[PDB]
Design a protein around this ligand. Sequence first.
Ligand SMILES: CC(=O)N1CCc2[nH]c3ccc(C(=O)Nc4ccc(N5CCOCC5)cc4)cc3c2C1
Length: 116
Amino acid sequence: AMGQRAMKFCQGVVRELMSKKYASFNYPFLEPVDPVALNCPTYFDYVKEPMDLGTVSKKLSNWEYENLDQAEHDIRLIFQNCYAFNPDGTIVNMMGHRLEDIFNTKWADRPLYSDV
Ligand SMILES: CC(=O)N1CCc2[nH]c3ccc(C(=O)Nc4ccc(N5CCOCC5)cc4)cc3c2C1
């Protein structure tokens, strides 16, 4: 449903967030959380809609988002899950906050207008 300009903007933002530039604090957020492999077996007692950057990218690439608000919701869900599960002071929590700061900076430039 999304037009080309907004779609391209979102794909760019997500790929930048997954880019090597941010490797130092984005790596817990590229793929879906695996509770057992990470020794966090209670993960899905705290989180009910898992989300990750790779997932948002895949949904974008399949034209699954009608609009920037839906894409923004999934992306913010990444960080909301992060903070719901990782207590204050944990390394993953702090990486999540850092990644959200970068996301907000990039997103403030979002296309305000669409037109076909
Ligand atoms: C999001 C969240 O809420 N979690 C809950 C608590 C928690 N604890 C962790 C400890 C370690 C890791 C981890 O090692 N992730 C990791 C991912 C990818 C790679 N690579 C493979 C390919 O890409 C290049 C490198 C290396 C590592 C992740 C976590 C999480 C996730």
